[PDB]
Amino acid sequence: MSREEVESLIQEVLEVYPEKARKDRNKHLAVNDPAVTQSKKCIISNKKSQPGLMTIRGCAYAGSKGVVWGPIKDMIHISHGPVGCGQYSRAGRRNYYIGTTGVNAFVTMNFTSDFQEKDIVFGGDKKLAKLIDEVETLFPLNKGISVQSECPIGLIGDDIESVSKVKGAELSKTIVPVRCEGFRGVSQSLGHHIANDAVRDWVLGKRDEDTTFASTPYDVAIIGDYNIGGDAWSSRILLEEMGLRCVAQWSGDGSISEIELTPKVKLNLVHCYRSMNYISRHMEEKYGIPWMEYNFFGPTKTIESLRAIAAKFDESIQKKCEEVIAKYKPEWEAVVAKYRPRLEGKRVMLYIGGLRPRHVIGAYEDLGMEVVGTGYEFAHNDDYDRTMKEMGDSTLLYDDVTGYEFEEFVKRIKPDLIGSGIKEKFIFQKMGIPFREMHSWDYSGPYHGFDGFAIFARDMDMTLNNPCWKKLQAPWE
Amino acid sequence: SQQVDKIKASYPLFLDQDYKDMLAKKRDGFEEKYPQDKIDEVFQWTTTKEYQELNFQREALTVNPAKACQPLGAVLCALGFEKTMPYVHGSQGCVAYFRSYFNRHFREPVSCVSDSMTEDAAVFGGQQNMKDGLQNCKATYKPDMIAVSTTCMAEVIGDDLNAFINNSKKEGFIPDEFPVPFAHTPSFVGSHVTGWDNMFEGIARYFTLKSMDDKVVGSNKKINIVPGFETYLGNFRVIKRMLSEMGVGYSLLSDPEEVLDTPADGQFRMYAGGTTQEEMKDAPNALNTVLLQPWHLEKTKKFVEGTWKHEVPKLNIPMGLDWTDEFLMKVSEISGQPIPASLTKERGRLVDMMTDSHTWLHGKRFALWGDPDFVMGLVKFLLELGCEPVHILCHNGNKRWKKAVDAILAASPYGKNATVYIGKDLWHLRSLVFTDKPDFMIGNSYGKFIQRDTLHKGKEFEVPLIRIGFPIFDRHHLHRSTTLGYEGAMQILTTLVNSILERLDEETRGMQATDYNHDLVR
Amino acid sequence: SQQVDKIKASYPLFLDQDYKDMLAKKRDGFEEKYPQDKIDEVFQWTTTKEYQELNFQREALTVNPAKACQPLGAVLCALGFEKTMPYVHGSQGCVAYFRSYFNRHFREPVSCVSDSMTEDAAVFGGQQNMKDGLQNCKATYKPDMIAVSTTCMAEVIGDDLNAFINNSKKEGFIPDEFPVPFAHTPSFVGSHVTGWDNMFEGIARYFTLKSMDDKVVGSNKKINIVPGFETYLGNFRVIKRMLSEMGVGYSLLSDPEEVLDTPADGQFRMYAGGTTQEEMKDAPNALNTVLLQPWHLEKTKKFVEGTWKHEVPKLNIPMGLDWTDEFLMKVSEISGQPIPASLTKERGRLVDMMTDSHTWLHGKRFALWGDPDFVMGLVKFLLELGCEPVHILCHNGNKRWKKAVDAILAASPYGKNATVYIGKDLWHLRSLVFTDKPDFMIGNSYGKFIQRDTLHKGKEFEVPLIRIGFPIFDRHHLHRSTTLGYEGAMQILTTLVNSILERLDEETRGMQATDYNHDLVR
């Protein structure tokens, strides 16, 4: 609304900053124009953060370990380096898995080298080999090892690839090294790229020559769904109701066996483009498997995506798909009939790192809710190309927004709800603005599919309308 | 399938028949999972003494540590000063993790700033990063002080903090009179409490080492209290309360409780409370300086005894009855103020609770892990209550602390079946509680998994966890509790006795089986 | 058989095989127990809805009541005055039971005497008992005042207290100036809170009825506080603290917090603190009188309005956010003192906690029982938290109270489910929680059996109990909790949210079954 007022708002936030910081931050703020189809012409992204501005993005170690490799259950992941880095990420992101922790599943643990001064000054390859042997003797049911590097690993002259090769030749075990040092890159995105390269280079080609797996013309692989609160299972129940066969999901509740069996599927359904587009492109180039993007946020996007998947198979798949949509129509219809009147016409401002701000919009608009501003901490240009067409006219778009900028933006716009990372959760609750933790579904969920849309609507209703947001002001002032 | 009038979240939606069948199909078809009997046999093997020997022969692998890296404590210490911005030289993922950790513990906004160091900096240093970051932070968040802590990456590449700060000041990036204390906090040394110590020492040296000309010991008639790494606001509150009713003059150094407890009234306050720079400058003019947690305030004690010429008393942490008595008597001796009748009545009420709750407490076995001073104070209180601390674990302890705890245990007849472990982690404690079963565990939220493991072996083998320590993530508003003094002792006693009583209530709730002992009166 | 190293109490000693065989032999041979299948059938029948219609139908039989008799409240009220001995005119079993009840709740000595009326007094009245008891108690325990209550035996006899005490004074058993206030407290009228009201009115009328000539309202610039039947010491403490932080002169009338919490220092104090006779005498000089629990202070309200000429404000119990705000506003208006910044910060902190815990609290179903004012304050707080009180039970509530509570539930969308029950006991509540399962119960220790019953039907039908109210017997030191004020509200919030989180943790602890939701962070 009133582009000139939004432009005046942006400029006023820019004025406090020094000249260099203002010049850099000018290009990361934009006003959405749906007609514009090239993001680089108005908004820029994937640049180095400005120092001392209270940024929000993480490191490459986060994007590799806690995002890609972490949720793989039967692997053991070693945070190579000092203790704290692996301690802060233990069970901090919830990816649901079915297993016995300590025996065959090790997701919610912290294996670390626990570097000391002697390791810093003398290296840690010997300690790495001893650690591998200790892991082998104490955890005999682990089907593979991952070694995620921290900053001093790359900074000192340590060689983990040779150790990995030697130990994997000795114990006949898959041991992958990941050069996911935090100082590499500008955010968690390069962590995604490095982790995908590691998966391609050490895990994907294990079962290339093996052809003892029976293949079905309805074989699909889920890529980029990390089962946050049970999201992947909610998508998979719909997919198997469509009559397809899911051989793998990457990488929430995932295993090394499904990763190795992935090249045998007929189609690659990529849920998160940003984190796992590289592996899908490599798969299409090598094995000739097509990959396509789907969106299960909201009944409208879920139905459209299901029809899109059915349009790539035979007539029975389309028939069974139509049957699933008819079977689940009344449930989401009742959910809408219950929760739309209490959320219609409310405005939200969301800041999530990649995929989710464009994805979540369909679920919000379905509940009659308008997104009056959206941003990505680490998303590339193509994410913005999708966002512009997915976004309403004359809305605000931000890249790598800082605490001050986001604070002033919400103070001037006054949204009814904010969806954001925990770093901003208590900041915006103290202002009386209802807040929803998009990264962890606020310890609720799942949100995907017809099963998750009810939970999404219920959570939105309870946060938007509460008997607390009306009591921030003492009635004697 | 979801009913509109009764919606189910992940538990127990995924216990539905179709979801169970889908998960079974996935596992049977594509997971290539080990057979269940093999899993059960490996689990049973993990709970035996041979596994304990193998796990205690570990030399290189660490599983489930009970400590954090150095700069976290430095950030917490920096948060305790008025309008002071914690600034960390290095990469930004460290700061993101610190803010997330403290947000999850305190459920409060935590503000930290980073220079966003990158691989191009690794080869050329972070001088330009420091200059730009200092200028931007000062211009953006308007602090009265920026406190600098170093990431392990900055320490490895050997960044000189003093030279970079001086060059930033000289070239006009920041005013030359702007206070910018710095501390070197290598994450490969010690733990977070060492970071708190390093940052406090750096700030104190920044404000007082140069000005020794006009400082007279005992001039302002005040006592300096250094709390150390503390994550209970009630501890600061109780320390301030006991001195104020006493009427002794006091000066709390580095207290973040006002920042970590901010009212929700419609506005966000980035800064709140703290200790003024005037207090830091006037610090050497005090009669003495008291350290609440001596076993990680070591360099601070060295600096205070060397530069301030203060005779720091040999006081333990004021945890329990006897140590609170000693702390109160030492403050009375230093300040010349008598101990009031209110303190006496509070102590008497603590003794009354001890006498009323003694029969349930007596002979109970506890396994405890935590920071050295907190662990030792807990051991002292447990021995005072007639409890038996069996497995005492401190990942970041040292040999001297272990000797002190051994002496404390030997001084009481209840420490006979007690072993102190230093440098061990929570997998070692898992083995210890599987092979030598205690009655309860005492520790932070990371013990919730150990309980789970014990419950998998059997209900009669389950070890319930009592959440006393840092961090607590799965419970709400426990950071408002108190641990120090008579009030903290009362709270800890209530928690212990009522945990025992809830466990007994659970064990005897079986109709016609065990409910003959389901007593109304306990 | 016992092992000297591991000695076993009744649980689990009677779970040994020989004891099991002994009990089986006894039951099979001599008990003539009903078949176990018949017992299970009758239990399942007691669960159902047709049983609930039979249980609701009863107009005479009371099963597991939720109230006591008047002299208990009379003794509690009398205990709140300085150097005052509670004196119950009647049989000694009453006094023994009162003392045991209060000893079990407070875990503190409770001093009370009787005149031990027997068949002799049953035939010829108890005047000689009164004379001898007054003289004996005054000579032996040396009180400054004796407050006289009655048991049901005295009321049926028709013994009158005024003539007996006047004859005691006239015949030289006690000095004519010795204060002996009295009240008639029939156990067949009302409940214990009614007895508290009667005793307080008796004392106030004794000290402030024959000298109204020189009393000027507002001359001492103080506000009278009448707490009512209160079994939480934190409530007295929080009222005192809130009024002291506000610079408001106040007189707490009948505060027993000192004698109910005395230090253990090697000596026993029969008396400690309490409202002084001078404060009672000067009470009509106060600006106004506020009643903390209006719904069981009615005769006291009539006396204060019609004799002291005080315009008693229409206030609810200061529980929750809104009613605490209203209480502070009324105090500010009456005393002419502004609300300080400390109270504003405390209220903001409470709002912060509410917004932090709102996601877990939203939509939880609660079944609660207790005294009228406490129940209505708890329902109000539950409504402000987004919780659903579905079963509201008050054994000692009337129809006006029910109308007020229904009006309170009407002004919120969270009271659509709610229904209010008066005159119903805890067997009715067991039927209610079986046929309409809530998430939790909120009540005293007597609910622990209801939980037991639910657990017998199955773990998915278990309704955990939360212990707030009177009396609490199976937990230690919970009487030191605060229910009143922002402090009480945040304590209640912590208890509720952590009980919910503990229940979720227990449910999601099964390895490979439900532990996918066993989250570290909540």
Ligand code: ICS
């Ligand atoms: S992987 Fe990425 S930051 Fe695509 S690193 Fe991050 S579980 Fe976010 S916006 Mo946490 S690119 Fe997933 C994400 Fe989105 S951890 Fe989760 S919520 S959809």
Ligand code: CLF
């Ligand atoms: S940017 Fe990323 S999270 Fe930061 S260190 Fe670097 S890889 Fe790691 Fe782990 S150990 Fe502690 S927290 Fe750091 S200071 Fe040294």
Ligand SMILES: [Fe+3]
């Ligand atoms: Fe908070």
Ligand SMILES: [Fe+3]
């Ligand atoms: Fe007691």
